[PDB]
């Protein structure tokens, strides 16, 4: 369900990110075009610490909080990219991300991201 206005929102979210804003505009456009919706019910984990990363996400609606074990670190601001660290640095997920309310995201698969990155 991704129209002109939603693509602008995703584009602007991606360009907030210190890494992604250094990408070519076409690479950002590719990311947006290749993203798909993933929604999560309150209580579910989007990301679990120590797992391999398989997506980059943009938060589109709802509340997401970041934890390391039982320690609460942050609430992810709306229309912000997350889950980029494990993908960009090939470390495991640095922290868990949990849906505090029902959440909507736009997701990009790792393999598609890596395909886009290779046009650098």
Ligand X SMILES: Nc1nc2c(ncn2[C@@H]2O[C@@H]3COP(=O)(O)O[C@H]3[C@H]2O)c(=O)[nH]1
Q: Which residues are annotated as a binding site for 3',5'-cyclic GMP?
A: 83-86, 93-94
Q: Which stretch binds Na ion (CB under 5 A): 1-9, 33-41, 54-62, 63-71?
A: 63-71
Q: What is the DSSP letter of 41?
A: -
Nearer to ligand X, 6 or 65 (CB): 65
* DSSP-derived secondary structure letter, 51: S
| Closer of 36 and 89 to Na ion (Cβ) | 89
Q: Exposed e or buried b for every residue in 44-59, given b needs 16+ CB within 10 A?
A: eebbebeeebebbbbb
Binding site for ligand X (CB under 6 A): 47, 53, 66, 73-74, 76, 82-86, 93-95, 97
Task: Closer to ligand X by CB, 23 or 95: give it.
Answer: 95
Least spacing, CB of residue 4 vs ligand X, in Å:
27
* 92 near Na ion, rule: CB under 5 A: no
Q: How far apart are CA 64 and CA 33, in angstroms?
A: 24
Is 105:58 a contact under the CB 8 Å cutoff?
Answer: yes
């Amino acid at each position: 369900r991704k129209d002109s206005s939603e693509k602008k929102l995703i584009t602007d979210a991606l360009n907030k990110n210190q890494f992604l804003k250094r990408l070519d505009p076409q690479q950002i456009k590719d990311m947006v075009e290749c993203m798909y919706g993933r929604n999560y019910q309150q209580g579910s984990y989007i990301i679990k610490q120590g797992e391999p990363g398989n997506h980059i996400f943009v938060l589109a609606e709802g509340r997401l909080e970041v934890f390391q074990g039982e320690k609460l670190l942050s609430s992810i601001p709306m229309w912000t990219t997350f889950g980029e660290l494990a993908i960009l640095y090939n470390c495991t997920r640095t922290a868990s991300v949990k849906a505090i309310t029902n959440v909507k995201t736009w997701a990009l698969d790792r393999e598609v991201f890596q395909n886009i990155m290779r046009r650098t």
